[PDB]
Design a protein around this ligand. Sequence first.
Ligand code: 1PV
Length: 562
Amino acid sequence: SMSYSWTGALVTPCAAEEQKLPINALSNSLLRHHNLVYSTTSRSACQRQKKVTFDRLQVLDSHYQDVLKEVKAAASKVKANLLSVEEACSLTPPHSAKSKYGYGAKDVRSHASRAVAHINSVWKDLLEDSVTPIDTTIMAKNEVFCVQPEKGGRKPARLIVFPDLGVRVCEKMALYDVVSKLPLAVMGSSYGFQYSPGQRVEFLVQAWKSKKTPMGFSYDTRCFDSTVTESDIRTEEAIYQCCDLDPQARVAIKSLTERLYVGGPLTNSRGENCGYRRCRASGVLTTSCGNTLTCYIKARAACRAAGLQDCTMLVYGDDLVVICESAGVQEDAASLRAFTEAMTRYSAPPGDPPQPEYDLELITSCSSNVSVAHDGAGKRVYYLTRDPTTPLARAAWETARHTPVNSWLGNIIMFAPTLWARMILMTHFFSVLIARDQLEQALDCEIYGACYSIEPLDLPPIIQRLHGLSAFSLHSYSPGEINRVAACLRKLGVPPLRAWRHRARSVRARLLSRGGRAAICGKYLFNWAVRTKLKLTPIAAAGQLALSGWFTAGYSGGDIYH
Ligand SMILES: CNC(=O)c1c(-c2ccc(F)cc2)oc2cc(N(Cc3ccc(B(O)O)c(F)c3)S(C)(=O)=O)c(C3CC3)cc12
């Protein structure tokens, strides 16, 4: 069937939508080529609608069925509980889209009578009705990028589809424990979200070394969400139902599948009927879990049809990396084309055809890649990095305008060992916080989709736990990585690294003079900025922190707060 059917009504905005990066002195100090930086808006929604709309032809085979059997078998070891209303309410972010029924995120979070009354009635309705399609809102995501004329200039906005706040709370009640436990049990080491960035690196490196002659590739499915069929969404439900579940949970899961997940009507911000969805909803709790499962199932089956030898897979939502034993150059190319063919039959053809890579560093997934630096003692250290353009463009925007969720903090945490994060992002934001007297205030940032409340002053212990002490001592980065950062700076009109070094020394000093946690920031985060180096020893605070939930519970679709 058609992934979507449209009425003609436009995807409409809620409030004013700034297109171009605002001129602000502090954002300008990071990035000056403001004309290159843009936010996607509802104005480009039609362009996206065209791309995401198509017929799905799906043909399953014995390899697929074999794999699905394995998955259902593994899922049967999982025991998931219902969350209570109160528990589900606290997993709601404060910034979450308000209900159409006279309450918002703040009210959910403080268990207000009108919110709980509606949530209970929505729950009752899920148990009583299993067929009536549930209403959803369609919105155009406002995301920031840098323009690329070479690649056809401005990207069209992504479409986010979500049900009302009340339903989203009920989703947590029914499924949060399932989406938290199931993927890991089913996929084991292939489940991407379990890994901290440091662990992810170690996993990729060992997988690479475990082959006599390694070959790797990434597979990018064109419009993964549109490729997910009704039957894929029902297969997911069948898999959820393999777990040991509460009776009410089973009813609610089945209702949410048939009334919400498989499809339903799309309403714009002005209440107009936009059309109907028959594919994955971007803004539901199960999006991340479901996409990972379906991708994994299709990929694992496709590996077999492709005749790939000794396959190690890493799956994060629609992001797939496979590392395997090479059969020869021509043999590998051949098997990769057969892989693509299998995936296509499974309804998930590529955006760009996958290419074999015989060097680990060349594999790009989730827009990241492995690279090499050296630690204090000159030992080789691997770490995850990425092209800094988008992180920098967003960082500038987020300086110019207050955004409820702050991606820059996420990037500092996620890419802490990197040259660009340490020298530019850290220096910049610590100088901005100092300038605005916001150094002690907690911020909301997203990590692997989940929304977190993080104090900037806790950055050092967080980094140590996620990346190790070496993250504060890396030097002698690779020439490729330096060149990529350099090229990014030129393109965006960001000051050069040495300029940042000077600034970082000043920031460091200001931080050290405040004592306490701020001193530790100055000491550990900016040790690179001075020749006369302080001794970096393990931080006590890191030990006295529990960071486990960080690499278990994250769903981009999910509206999750920790
Ligand atoms: C299947 N691919 C992988 O699982 C990952 C590879 C990869 C790279 C090369 C290779 F050969 C194989 C795999 O790199 C990764 C780096 C990240 N990080 C950043 C990051 C990147 C994008 C998003 B997002 O817009 O969805 C995000 F939320 C975070 S992070 C913090 O550093 O670990 C992640 C995190 C969980 C999403 C996954 C992978």
